Structure formats: C-alpha cells, structure tokens
Amino acid sequence: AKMIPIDDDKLIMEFKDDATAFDGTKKARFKGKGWLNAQLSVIFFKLLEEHGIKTHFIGVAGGNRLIVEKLDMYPLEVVVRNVVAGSLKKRLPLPEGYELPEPIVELYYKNDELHDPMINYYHAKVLGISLDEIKKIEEIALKVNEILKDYLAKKGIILVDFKLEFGKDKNGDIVLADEISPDTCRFWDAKTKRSLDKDVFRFDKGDLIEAYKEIYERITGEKPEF
Amino acid sequence: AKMIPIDDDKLIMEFKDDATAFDGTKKARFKGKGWLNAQLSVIFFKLLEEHGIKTHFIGVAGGNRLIVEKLDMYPLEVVVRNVVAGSLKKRLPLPEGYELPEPIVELYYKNDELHDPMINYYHAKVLGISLDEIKKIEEIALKVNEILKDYLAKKGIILVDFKLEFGKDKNGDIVLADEISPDTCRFWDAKTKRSLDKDVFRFDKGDLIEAYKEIYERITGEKPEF
Numbered sequence: 091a092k093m094i095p096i097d098d099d100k101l102i103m104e105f106k107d108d109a110t111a112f113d114g115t116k117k118a119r120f121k122g123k124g125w126l127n128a129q130l131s132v133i134f135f136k137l138l139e140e141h142g143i144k145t146h147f148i149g150v151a152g153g154n155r156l157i158v159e160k161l162d163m164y165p166l167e168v169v170v171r172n173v174v175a176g177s178l179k180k181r182l183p184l185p186e187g188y189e190l191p192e193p194i195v196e197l198y199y200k201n202d203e204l205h206d207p208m209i210n211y212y213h214a215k216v217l218g219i220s221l222d223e224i225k226k227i228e229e230i231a232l233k234v235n236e237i238l239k240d241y242l243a244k245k246g247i248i249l250v251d252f253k254l255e256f257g258k259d260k261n262g263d264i265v266l267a268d269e270i271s272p273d274t275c276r277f278w279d280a281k282t283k284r285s286l287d288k289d290v291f292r293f294d295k296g297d298l299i300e301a302y303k304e305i306y307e308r309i310t311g312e313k314p315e316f
Numbered sequence: 317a318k319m320i321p322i323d324d325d326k327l328i329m330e331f332k333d334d335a336t337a338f339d340g341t342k343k344a345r346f347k348g349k350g351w352l353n354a355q356l357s358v359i360f361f362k363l364l365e366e367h368g369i370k371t372h373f374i375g376v377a378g379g380n381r382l383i384v385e386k387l388d389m390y391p392l393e394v395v396v397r398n399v400v401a402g403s404l405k406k407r408l409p410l411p412e413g414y415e416l417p418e419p420i421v422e423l424y425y426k427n428d429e430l431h432d433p434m435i436n437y438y439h440a441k442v443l444g445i446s447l448d449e450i451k452k453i454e455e456i457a458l459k460v461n462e463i464l465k466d467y468l469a470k471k472g473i474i475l476v477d478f479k480l481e482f483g484k485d486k487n488g489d490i491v492l493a494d495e496i497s498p499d500t501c502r503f504w505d506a507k508t509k510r511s512l513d514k515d516v517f518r519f520d521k522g523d524l525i526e527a528y529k530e531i532y533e534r535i536t537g538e539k540p541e542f
C-alpha cells in the first residue's frame with residue numbers, strides 16, 4: 091500500500107492504490123485510495139503536531155507523496171483499542187461493539203517470518219527496547235488516541251481502534267511515523283455503526299472507495315477533488 | 317492431570333496419572349506420575365515458603381493429595397522464561413536453547429473458549445485485575461524464578477521456563493496456587509541439555525516416568541518409593 095530515499099534527513103513516503111489483507115492472501119487495487127490516504131495522513135499528522143505530538147511529517151511532494159523525516163524505526167506496531175473489533179474478539183470474550191472501560195494498548199513485533207505476533211515489555215527488552223522507551227511510546231499512543239477520538243467524535247465518527255508506528259530521531263526523541271488513514275484505523279459512523287475503513291475491503295462490506303470518500307468529505311468538509 | 321472441596325478455608329488438590337497436551341488432542345496415562353508431581357509440588361512449595369513466598373500449601377493428605385488453601389483464583393497462567401523453548405520460538409526469532417539476557421514474564425488468560433491467549437496489563441485490567449495486582453504477581457513470579465533456578469542449578473538442572481497460577485486470600489494477599497512440577501516446568505539436564513519434564517510426553521522423546529523419576533532422585537537424593 092505504500093518509501094523512496096532522498097538523503098540523511100528525509101525520504102519520500104508514497105501511498106499506492108494497492109491494498110492487501112489477511113497476511114497478503116487477499117489483494118485488490120482501488121483507484122484513488124493512495125490519494126485519499128495520503129491526504130488523510132497529512133490532515134491527521136498536522137492535527138497531532140498542533141497538539142504537540144512529534145511526527146515524521148515534513149511536507150507534501152504532490153501526487154500521493156509525502157516528505158517525511160528519516161528515523162531509526164522501532165520494529166513495532168502499536169495498537170490502541172477503544173471498541174472491541176477484529177483480533178481483540180479472540181483475546182477477550184467480549185462482543186464486537188463492546189465499549190472498553192479504558193483504552194487497550196497492544197504491542198506487535200513487526201516480523202513477517204512470525205506473522206507480527208503480540209509481545210509485552212519483556213519481549214521488547216530482548217528486542218533492544220528499554221522499558222522507559224516503551225512507556226514513552228504507549229504514553230504518546232494514548233495521547234494520540236484522545237486527540238483523534240475527540241476530533242472524530244465531533245464529526246459523527248467513532249474511533250474504534252488504530253495502528254501506529256514509531257522511530258527515534260537523531261536527538262533520540264521518539265517520533266510518530268508510518269501513516270494514519272482508513273487503512274490503519276477502524277472508523278465507524280456514530281449513528282449506524284457502519285465501517286468507513288479497510289474492513290470494507292477485508293470483509294467485503296461494500297464499496298471501499300465510497301467509504302473512504304465519505305470519511306474524506308466528513309472530515310475536510312468538501313468532497314474529494316483527486 | 318489434577319480439586320475436591322472440603323469447606324471455606326481449604327480444599328483437596330489431587331494429582332492424577334492422566335496427562336494431556338496440545339489443547340487436549342493428545343492423551344495418555346502414566347502410572348506413578350500423580351505421585352511424583354504431588355511430591356515434587358510439596359518440596360517446591362516448602363522451599364518457596366522458607367524463602368517467604370505465600371503459597372496455598374497447607375499439608376499432605378496421603379496418596380497423591382494435598383491440603384491447600386481456598387482462594388479467589390485469578391484467571392491467569394503466569395509464565396517465566398529463562399531459556400528459549402516452546403511457544404517463545406514463535407514470538408521471538410531466537411533458537412531453542414538461547415539463553416535470555418533477563419527473564420521473560422508472559423501472562424495468559426485462562427479461557428478454554430479462546431485457547432488461553434496471551435494478554436498484557438491492559439487486557440488484565442479489563443478482566444478486573446489492577447496494574448498494582450499485576451505488578452505484585454510478576455514480582456512474586458520473578459522471585460520464585462530466582463529461588464527455583466538457583467536451587468536446581470546447584471543440582472545439575474537448568475530451569476528453562478515454567479507456569480504459575482495465583483489467587484487472592486481473604487486478607488486480599490496474593491497467594492501462589494496450582495502446582496509446581498515436571499508437568500508445569502521445563503527442566504533440562506545441565507550437561508546434556510536433555511528434557512526431564514512434560515516435553516518427553518509432548519514430543520515423544522522417551523520414557524516420561526523415567527525422566528520424572530530422575531528429577532525426583534536428583535532433587536530428593538533418594539529414588540522414588542511410591
């Protein structure tokens with residue numbers, strides 16, 4: 091769905107029209123999805139930067155391309171969950187739609203060989219990530235959560251869960267990386283509880299592009315120009 | 317492999333000759349195993365009690381039966397790992413036998429429906445277990461680890477990993493429960509690195525009873541009387 095090096099300080103992140111699911115056993119191509127996800131990442135990164143979150147966003151380079159800061163990437167995917175959906179149904183005997191009493195943070199080791207298994211703080215330590223780093227990472231993820239869920243709730247969108255990735259900059263500061271989009275979040279309409287995210291593609295729920303268009307219109311206030 | 321109520325304060329824990337593996341898809345019966353595991357649990361509980369670990373062990377009731385304290389059981393299995401073996405090979409790209417730089421503690425939610433999935437502190441909280449409780453539980457597991465690994469290393473046995481369970485007594489103190497035996501630990505001979513534990517049954521490595529007998533002889537100093 092997405093890195094083209096420039097130099098020491100920066101690289102290009104390009105969003106593609108490809109989508110994969112289920113460990114890459116399901117593939118399809120959606121015209122315009124690159125564009126939507128690039129635009130929506132920019133909007134989210136900017137909102138978070140205003141709230142004092144250090145992100146890798148530097149600028150736009152036209153098309154579906156962002157200029158981003160180069161980082162020593164942690165091999166983690168950091169998942170924040172507000173509402174029970176997806177893999178959480180297999181870890182806790184709770185139904186889809188269940189509202190958690192407080193946010194859940196899950197750590198996944200980015201490892202294709204092992205299919206991205208969940209880890210805790212001890213596994214992370216063996217992977218070279220101190221407890222203090224983990225604490226800072228979860229603290230940021232949790233703050234990101236509050237900002238994004240408030241912003242979206244005030245637009246008729248429930249932030250069900252989402253995935254973040256992080257890296258360290260040259261000062262040793264922890265920096266939010268990768269993307270933030272309907273590909274990497276669960277977004278539900280506040281009224282109907284309908285999916286406006288990758289679950290439309292994952293579980294064949296309708297038209298992916300239309301659901302992404304609705305999110306873009308309902309966030310930005312104007313329909314997608316492309 | 318094992319509860320017969322007495323009253324409010326206590327119950328009977330009986331160790332049986334049955335063994336199961338792989339989610340109960342593998343079954344077999346081993347004459348004498350109940351007896352060995354009961355005796356070895358007693359020895360371990362006593363050693364830990366001397367070192368100031370609160371356990372549910374009250375007394376022996378002859379045969380393969382222990383008198384134990386009744387508790388509000390946490391629905392957890394708490395795993396401590398010193399050497400890479402078993403499921404850890406699927407979570408970290410490390411070989412069997414790899415010596416961890418420090419102990420790993422893993423939490424599993426005891427749930428047959430969900431096949432005992434791993435959890436973190438956030439899942440535990442949703443299950444009703446405060447962060448403070450979790451911290452006390454891991455602190456005890458880690459202390460138990462030091463005591464058991466020292467004691468066994470001074471007998472030519474490597475403590476690879478093991479599983480603990482816990483409950484709360486009426487004072488709200490956290491109490492070590494279930495069993496401690498070759499069923500619930502990985503034990504390797506310090507020289508040959510051979511298994512003297514349930515892995516003999518799990519992966520058809522030889523004679524289970526003989527491996528358990530060796531552990532009993534090499535711990536107690538005398539061969540099993542039965």
Ligand SMILES: Nc1nc2c(ncn2[C@@H]2O[C@H](COP(=O)(O)O)[C@@H](O)[C@H]2O)c(=O)[nH]1
Binds near residue numbers: 167177273274275288
């Ligand atoms: N695009 C993408 N999203 C992910 C991945 N892993 C987790 N997520 C996001 O994180 C949340 C939880 O995922 P789950 O564990 O339920 O599959 C969902 O919003 C999901 O979209 C991934 O590998 N790719």
Ligand SMILES: Nc1nc2c(ncn2[C@@H]2O[C@H](COP(=O)(O)O)[C@@H](O)[C@H]2O)c(=O)[nH]1
Binds near residue numbers: 501
């Ligand atoms: N008897 C028993 N032992 C377990 C269970 N779950 C974990 N253990 C113990 O905890 C350690 C780690 O298990 P693993 O996750 O590698 O299967 C091993 O020593 C194993 O014997 C269980 O359900 N039953």
